[PDB]
Every structure is written in structure tokens, then in C-alpha cells.
Swiss-Prot record:
Signal peptide: none annotated. Controls somatic sexual differentiation. Binds directly and specifically to the FBE (fat body enhancer) of the yolk protein 1 and 2 genes (Yp1 and Yp2). This enhancer is sufficient to direct the female-specific transcription characteristic of the Yp genes in adult fat bodies. Involved in regulation of male-specific expression of takeout in brain-associated fat body. Experimentally shown to bind zinc. It is found in: Nucleus. The chain holds residues 35 to 86 of 549 of the full protein. Changing residue 34 to D/Y: Abolishes DNA-binding. This is Protein doublesex. Changing residue 16 to Y: Abolishes DNA-binding. It comes from Drosophila melanogaster.
Length: 52
């Protein structure tokens, strides 16, 4: 693996106040597909389209 530094807990569900540890989760994230502006802002934090 080239990413041994995984993020703690799932961020999709913390947006609402969830903490599952993201261990074998994602599909288990009640927010796995949420769309609120805190779940989109999250996926946005990881993706990078412009640098400053
Ligand atoms: Zn989650
Ligand atoms: Zn959300």
C-alpha cells in the first residue's frame, strides 16, 4: 500500500456528528451518499483542482 496514513473515523458521517472510525465503513456511512454542504465540503477537502 502507498497510503499507510489513513484518516481517523469517517468524515462523511462526522458532518452530522457521527464517529464510526471509518474502519470497513464508507458503504456503511449513513452519509455514504449524503449531499449536505458539509459532506460536499469534505469530499472537496480531499480532492484538489486548484493550488495556491
Ligand atoms: Zn461515515
Ligand atoms: Zn452530509
Amino acid at each position: 500500500s502507498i497510503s499507510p496514513r489513513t484518516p481517523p473515523n469517517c468524515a462523511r458521517c462526522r458532518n452530522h456528528g457521527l464517529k464510526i472510525t471509518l474502519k470497513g465503513h464508507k458503504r456503511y456511512c449513513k452519509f455514504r451518499y449524503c449531499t449536505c454542504e458539509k459532506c460536499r465540503l469534505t469530499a472537496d477537502r480531499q480532492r484538489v483542482m486548484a493550488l495556491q
